[PDB]
């Protein structure tokens, strides 16, 4: 028993991290087969960040302007191209530690692990969620650009996030591995702010099920509600509306605890209207929304990986 | 910026995890050079857990009673011995992925990363603290025994914890890698309970500094206090007393924020007496005590590793 913010083991990703330098700027790259992926703003100078024209900036570069280092070994850049907001650097050597992988775009509310890196060197691993406003509440210092986010499906690493920038509110924005931004953000220094965030309701419900599995039961009650009555209360408190698909996703947790979803919704409705009154749930005094139903099952039933 | 529960990258440890089977019982082992380390209760049956005599149980075993598997490869056990509560299995093959390592015993209040494993296969990584009552609030299911806890110092893995059991309150107990239990616990099924836990004060202060670094300032005030006046209030609320050594450890964070330790203590004293009144600090509505001063510096300044 117990419940922790649990990340995926990072070994398979650590062996893909490299350092990429172009001019004065150094950041992190992802080396898979014979391609290194990194944020395209590695080719910008201080004067260019304001209003960069990436097509011009790239045509003025040649392969030898790009220093790629994998630990001590230097990688020779054979070619380069731009795919949306990512630079693809073809190198002479394929990474022998390339895992089975795929590139997937995740949806708001889904979680992944982040391997925070500096100078091509892994520093720490942590779990976070893609927020409904398409930012992540990460922990990143200068030099962390090109750090990646990922999930593991059995033997396969699904890369879903590459870090590009920090917004003025301290939250973080990036792209999928095809270079397409999550959210309405651009890789130029402008006056872009995140829109209004909401609480991920299906995740809060999954976490309440985790609590029940771990012996926290004080918030339960005998009532039941309907989807529409709950959603009426949810909207008032800036909670995402709940759908039938969400109810279905929660099925396995309903089954294991014998507590119907709509039953759990009535507890949630009560917590939203009265608060928690100095009581905690799984060691928290706030409702936690960064565990998916799948995270809970995995941690409260025990799936491993390659 | 940002602040997360950050674990160490686990790659160097993942390559040391093996599966150990003896009879009906399978758990995890740590394979370093030509030795596999695992909990000695792997040699117990159901009848033995009540009152095991490990000397007798071990003399009745031979090397071939021990099945050690590293992925698909089977490891041949050449010898075996007991060191306190750990079994040391000598195998015919030295682990080529053995990192630079050492065995260290940690103190209450220190943090480490846990690589939770099942059947020799890494499942997840998370950060926790050794509590003042010598338990950890982990997340472990059946089969997790032999999972290890570790820190990374530059290139070197410091192993500090091996998981042995879950106590009736849902918290977890184990040994250092020399087989000596943390706390007054024994590896037999008896009526052992954890003693009273306290809050790790120096860690709460470090976390308040992290908050200030990240722009949460609402709890600060102009007052200062003395060590003895603070400790008088701390005792009332089940907080560990604060020493001059703690003040010294917090020095770097005092320097970076310009807020003296005793100044920060007056804020803490206020938070203990009035509460937080619906305000949060770094996204928490409770005072967090599982980040050391070193954790904060590392995350708010950015140290990497091999
Ligand atoms: O390393 C960080 C960084 C990342 C982070 O998440 N937090 C933080 O403090 N620093 N940089 C800030 C964003 N930079 C940038 C943005 C746009 C363009 Cl066009 C060019 C450069 C690169 C450097
Ligand atoms: O895998 C777990 C386990 C670990 C955990 O942390 N949480 C959980 O639910 N299960 N076992 C419970 C403790 N067992 C045991 C204890 C003492 C002796 Cl002498 C022999 C066996 C081994 C099996």
The half-sphere exposure of A50 on its side-chain side, counting CA atoms within 13 A, is: 2
Closest CA to A220 of A254, A271, A285, A288: A271
Three-class secondary structure of residue B172 per DSSP: strand
Under a CB-based contact definition with an 8 Å cutoff, are residues B236 and B229 in contact?
A: no
| Alpha-carbon distances of A56 from A21, A39, A42, A82, B283, rounded to whole Å | 19, 16, 14, 12, 43
* Dihedral of the alpha carbons of A110, A112, A118, A119, in degrees to the nearest 10: -100
B290 Cβ contact partners less than 8 Å away, ≥ 6 residues apart: B5, B111, B127, B128, B129, B200, B203
What pairing do the DSSP bridges indicate for beta strands A86-91 and A77-83? Answer: antiparallel
**Domain limits for position B49:** 11-91
Determine the Cα–Cα distance for residues A289 and A294; give it in Å rounded to an integer: 13
What pairing do the DSSP bridges indicate for beta strands B148-153 and B111-118? Answer: antiparallel
B130 φ/ψ angles, rounded to the nearest 5 degrees: -75, 115
- A179: phi > 0 → left, psi -120 to 50 → alpha, else beta; which? left
Three-class secondary structure of residue B224 per DSSP: coil
- The reply to whether residue B6 touches residue A125, judged by beta carbons under 8 angstroms, is yes
Other CB atoms within a 10 A radius of the CB of residue A140 amount to 25
Q: Which residues line ligand 1 (CB under 6 A)?
A: A 41, 44, 49, 52, 140-145, 165-166, 172, 187-189; B 1
Determine the Cα–Cα distance for residues A173 and A155; give it in Å rounded to an integer: 28
Under a CB-based contact definition with an 8 Å cutoff, are residues B113 and B125 in contact?
A: yes
User: What per-residue string of b and e applies to B45-54 under the rule 16 or more CB within 10 Å gives b?
Assistant: eeebeeebeb
Tokens 């509590």 correspond to B131
Copy the structure tokens of residue B145. Answer: 């025994």
Determine the Cα–Cα distance for residues B150 and B103; give it in Å rounded to an integer: 9
A141 φ/ψ angles, rounded to the nearest 5 degrees: -110, 180
Ligand closest to Cα of B165 equals 2
Closest CA to A83 of A174, A209, A176, A206: A176
Copy the structure tokens of residue A107. Answer: 């949806």
Under a CB-based contact definition with an 8 Å cutoff, are residues A2 and A17 in contact?
A: no
B189 Cα: distance to centroid of ligand 2 (angstroms): 9
Cα four-point dihedral sign B289, B291, B297, B299: negative
Copy the structure tokens of residue B253. Answer: 């964070």
| Alpha-carbon distances of A86 from A24, A40, A165, rounded to whole Å | 19, 5, 13
From the CA atom positions of chain A, what is the Rg in Å?
22
A211 Cβ contact partners less than 8 Å away, ≥ 6 residues apart: A3, A217, A219, A281, A282
Determine the Cα–Cα distance for residues B247 and A167; give it in Å rounded to an integer: 34
The half-sphere exposure of B15 on its side-chain side, counting CA atoms within 13 A, is: 17
Three-class secondary structure of residue B263 per DSSP: helix
Under a CB-based contact definition with an 8 Å cutoff, are residues A61 and A79 in contact?
A: no
Experimental technique behind these coordinates: X-ray
Q: Is B143 exposed, middle or buried, given 0-12, 13-18 or 19+ CB atoms closer than 10 A?
A: buried
Angle of CA points B260, B263, B264, to nearest 5°: 90
Closest CA to A269 of A287, A252, A281, A284: A287
Angle at which helices B227-236 and B261-274 cross, to 10°: 30
A21 φ/ψ angles, rounded to the nearest 5 degrees: -120, 135
A144 Cβ contact partners less than 8 Å away, ≥ 6 residues apart: A27, A28, A116, A117, A118, A163
| Alpha-carbon distances of B118 from B23, B89, B130, B147, rounded to whole Å | 17, 19, 22, 8
**Is B281 part of the contact surface with chain A (CB cutoff 8 Å)?**
no
A246 is catalytic: no
**Is B301 part of the contact surface with chain A (CB cutoff 8 Å)?**
yes
Q: Nearest CA of chain B to the CA of A265: how many Å?
A: 23
Three-class secondary structure of residue B51 per DSSP: coil
Three-class secondary structure of residue B177 per DSSP: coil
Find the DSSP H helices in chain A: 11-14, 54-59, 201-213, 227-236, 244-249, 251-257, 261-274, 293-299
For this experimental structure, what is the resolution in angstroms?
2.0
Angle of CA points A305, B3, B9, to nearest 5°: 35
Give the A window 49-108 contacts with B, CB below 8 Å. Answer: none
DSSP structure class, residue B202: H
Closest CA to B213 of B181, B254, B175: B254
Under a CB-based contact definition with an 8 Å cutoff, are residues A4 and B128 in contact?
A: yes
Q: Nearest CA of chain A to the CA of B103: how many Å?
A: 21
B285 lines ligand 2 (CB under 6 A): no
Give the H/E segment covering residue B162: strand B156-166
Assign residue B58 the CATH number of its domain. 2.40.10.10
User: Measured between beta carbons, which residues in chain A are less than 8 angstroms from residue B6?
Assistant: 116, 124-126, 139
The half-sphere exposure of A294 on its side-chain side, counting CA atoms within 13 A, is: 8
Determine the Cα–Cα distance for residues B166 and B174; give it in Å rounded to an integer: 9
A156 is catalytic: no
Other CB atoms within a 10 A radius of the CB of residue B286 amount to 14
Determine the Cα–Cα distance for residues B40 and B32; give it in Å rounded to an integer: 17
Determine the Cα–Cα distance for residues B225 and A253; give it in Å rounded to an integer: 50
Under a CB-based contact definition with an 8 Å cutoff, are residues A17 and A29 in contact?
A: yes
Q: What is the DSSP string of A46-99?
A: TTTSSS--HHHHHHT--GGGEEEEETTEEEPEEEEEEETTEEEEEESS--TT--
Angle of CA points B216, B5, A166, to nearest 5°: 60
**Is B112 part of the contact surface with chain A (CB cutoff 8 Å)?**
no
The half-sphere exposure of B118 on its side-chain side, counting CA atoms within 13 A, is: 14
Determine the Cα–Cα distance for residues B99 and A11; give it in Å rounded to an integer: 13
Determine the Cα–Cα distance for residues A161 and A150; give it in Å rounded to an integer: 7
Copy the structure tokens of residue A98. Answer: 């390339």
Copy the structure tokens of residue A250. Answer: 């929660």
Assign residue B208 the CATH number of its domain. 1.10.1840.10
Under a CB-based contact definition with an 8 Å cutoff, are residues B50 and B188 in contact?
A: yes
Under a CB-based contact definition with an 8 Å cutoff, are residues B138 and B169 in contact?
A: no
Closest CA to A8 of B304, B70, B122: B122
* CA–centroid distance for A239 within its chain: 20
Angle at which helices B261-274 and B201-213 cross, to 10°: 100
A36 φ/ψ angles, rounded to the nearest 5 degrees: -110, 125
Other CB atoms within a 10 A radius of the CB of residue A272 amount to 17
| Alpha-carbon distances of B123 from A163, A166, A206, A230, B106, rounded to whole Å | 25, 30, 20, 36, 24
């Amino acid at each position: 028993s117990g419940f922790r913010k649990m990340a995926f083991p990072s070994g398979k990703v650590e062996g893909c991290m490299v350092q990429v330098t172009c001019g004065t700027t150094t950041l992190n790259g992802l080396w898979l087969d014979d391609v290194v992926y990194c944020p395209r703003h590695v080719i910008c100078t201080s004067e260019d960040m304001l209003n960069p024209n990436y097509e011009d900036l790239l045509i003025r570069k040649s392969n030898h302007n790009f220093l790629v280092q994998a630990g001590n070994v230097q990688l020779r850049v054979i070619g380069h191209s731009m795919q949306n907001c990512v630079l693809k650097l073809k190198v002479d050597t394929a990474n022998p530690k390339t895992p089975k992988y795929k590139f997937v775009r995740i949806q708001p509310g889904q979680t992944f692990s982040v391997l925070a890196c500096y100078n091509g060197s892994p520093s720490g691993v942590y779990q976070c969620a893609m927020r409904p406003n398409f930012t992540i509440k990460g922990s990143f210092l200068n030099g962390s650009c090109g750090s990646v986010g990922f999930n593991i499906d059995y033997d396969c690493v699904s890369f879903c996030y590459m870090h590009h920038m920090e917004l003025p509110t301290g939250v973080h924005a990036g792209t999928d591995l095809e270079g397409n931004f999550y959210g309405p953000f651009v890789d130029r220094q402008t006056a872009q702010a995140a829109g209004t965030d909401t609480t991920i309701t299906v995740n809060v419900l999954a976490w309440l099920y985790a609590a029940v599995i771990n012996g926290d039961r004080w918030f339960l009650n005998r009532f039941t509600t309907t989807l529409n009555d709950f959603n009426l209360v949810a909207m008032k408190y800036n909670y995402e509306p709940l759908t039938q698909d969400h109810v279905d996703i929660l099925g396995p947790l309903s089954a294991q605890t014998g507590i119907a979803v709509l039953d759990m919704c009535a507890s949630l409705k009560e917590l939203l209207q009265n608060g928690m009154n100095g009581r905690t749930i799984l060691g928290s005094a706030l409702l936690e929304d960064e565990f998916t139903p799948f995270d809970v099952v995995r941690q409260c039933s025990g799936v491993t990986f390659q």
